[PDB]
Amino acid sequence: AVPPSLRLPVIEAAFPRQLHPYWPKLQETTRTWLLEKRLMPADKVEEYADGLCYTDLMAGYYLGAPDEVLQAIADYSAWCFVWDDRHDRDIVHGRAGAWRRLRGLLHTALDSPGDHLHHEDTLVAGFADSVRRLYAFLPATWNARFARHFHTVIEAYDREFHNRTRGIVPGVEEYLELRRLTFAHWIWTDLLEPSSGCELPDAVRKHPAYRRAALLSQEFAAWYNDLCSLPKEIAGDEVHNLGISLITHHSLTLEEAIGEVRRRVEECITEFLAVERDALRFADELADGTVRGKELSGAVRANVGNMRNWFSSVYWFHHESGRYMVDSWDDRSTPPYVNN
């Protein structure tokens, strides 16, 4: 049961939740990876890792993924959360030097992950381990695009560092552009392809219906995170959240801002339902009779299915994960699972 201010009946009724059969193993393997790569303190992994639900979130998303592919995606996903925590703590403690160095190392590791598998910074070595494995599934053309996309994500984190250091809250439109990067829209979109076993040609994945379906899936996920993570983020002096930009620049009250974010999230859903029809008509057009057309048709169909699955996975993740349960913390500004 979800709180009325967070509840989305259309999700509950029309996007039934899915779970990949590898999830029980996935849960433990990622937990152990976090442990052995020293990405989270050992006692924090035992106390909090399972309750954080990072593996549940990916296992509800990339349905159909080879077990190995889902494992690398889940390790990378968990790493991303730990990176978000590190970024947060570097900002809070004014470690601009340590953040700048991490940022540079991540850019280099991204292009040559093999070189960085045993780097002395365990956050960098962990990144490189997951990225090296992601690079093993599809041609190097897909790897180059993932890298291009993630260099942009790191730089958006650097922009957030600048904003929070200066006490700047982005305008609403500026925020919406930044959020496509800090949420890593195009990374989750990229990872649809190794999950269905096919790198999509530019002409296919840039078709308007595929692009728009892919975008709305991510806008929904990012803004729903904004809605649900607003309490802990206000508490932690986070300034990046659609709700916070509206309060700051459109002078809404908190209640008005929650309402406005809800309405924007709702519209993503019914916009997605419209363009999903087009995206699936496109998948049928790809099935032209040929082997390649059938491969491409099947892959777009799977990808669009998972774009849909993201809605329910993200929806339930925010109600299940301890990441957001600020009311339970001794210090509302310092989550228990973060290394402070």
Ligand X SMILES: CC[N+](CC)(CC)Cc1ccccc1
Residues that bind ligand X (CB under 6 A): 57, 77, 80-81, 84, 183-184, 221, 225, 314, 317
Cβ at position 133, least distance to ligand X in Å:
17
* Residue 229 binds Mg ion, judged by CB under 5 A: yes
Interface pick for Mg ion out of 189, 217, 225, 303 (rule CB under 5 A): 225
- Sequence-separated contacts (24+) of 104-111 with Cβ below 8 Å: 106/154, 107/151, 107/154, 110/147, 110/150, 110/151, 110/154, 111/147
Closer Cβ to ligand X, 154 or 213, answer by number = 154
Distance (Å, whole) CA 215 – CA 192: 13
Please indicate if the annotation marks 225 as binding a ligand: yes
Closer Cβ to Mg ion, 225 or 297, answer by number = 225
Neighbour tally for 107: CB within 10 Å: 14
Closer Cβ to Mg ion, 117 or 235, answer by number = 235
Look at residue 77 and give the partner it binds from Mg ion, ligand X, none, a contact being a CB closer than 5 to 8 Å depending on partner kind: ligand X
Task: Tell me if 189 sits within 8 A of 142, measured CB to CB.
Answer: no
Task: Tokens 């269905």: give the residue.
Answer: 196
Alpha helix (H) residue ranges in the chain: 9-14, 23-36, 42-52, 54-59, 67-92, 96-111, 122-134, 140-166, 172-182, 185-196, 202-205, 208-235, 242-249, 254-286, 291-320
Cβ at position 85, least distance to ligand X in Å:
8
Q: What are the angstrom distances between the C-alpha of 132 and each of 14, 64, 175?
A: 37, 21, 31
> Which region, judged by CB under 5 A, interacts with Mg ion, from 27-35, 143-151, 185-193, 220-228?
220-228
Distance (Å, whole) CA 218 – CA 311: 9
Distance (Å, whole) CA 268 – CA 335: 30
Cβ at position 190, least distance to ligand X in Å:
13
Please indicate if the annotation marks 88 as binding a ligand: yes
Cβ at position 291, least distance to ligand X in Å:
36
Of the candidates 120, 136, 138, 118, which has an alpha carbon nearest to the alpha carbon of residue 128? 118
Provide CB contacts within 8 A for 4, sequence distance 6+: none
Please indicate if the annotation marks 233 as binding a ligand: yes
Closer Cβ to Mg ion, 225 or 248, answer by number = 225
Please indicate if the annotation marks 229 as binding a ligand: yes
* Residue 143 binds Mg ion, judged by CB under 5 A: no
Look at residue 184 and give the partner it binds from ligand X, Mg ion, none, a contact being a CB closer than 5 to 8 Å depending on partner kind: ligand X
> Which region, judged by CB under 5 A, interacts with Mg ion, from 61-69, 217-225, 319-327, 330-338?
217-225
Closer Cβ to ligand X, 29 or 182, answer by number = 182
Distance (Å, whole) CA 312 – CA 57: 9
Interface pick for Mg ion out of 12, 47, 84, 256 (rule CB under 5 A): 84
Closer Cβ to ligand X, 77 or 309, answer by number = 77
Look at residue 79 and give the partner it binds from Mg ion, ligand X, none, a contact being a CB closer than 5 to 8 Å depending on partner kind: none
Closer Cβ to ligand X, 12 or 84, answer by number = 84
Neighbour tally for 3: CB within 10 Å: 8
* Residue sitting closest to Mg ion (CB): 229
* Residue sitting closest to ligand X (CB): 84
Look at residue 183 and give the partner it binds from ligand X, Mg ion, none, a contact being a CB closer than 5 to 8 Å depending on partner kind: ligand X
Residues at the site binding Mg ion, with contacts judged by CB under 5 A: 84, 225, 229
Binding residues for Mg(2+): 84, 88, 225, 229, 233
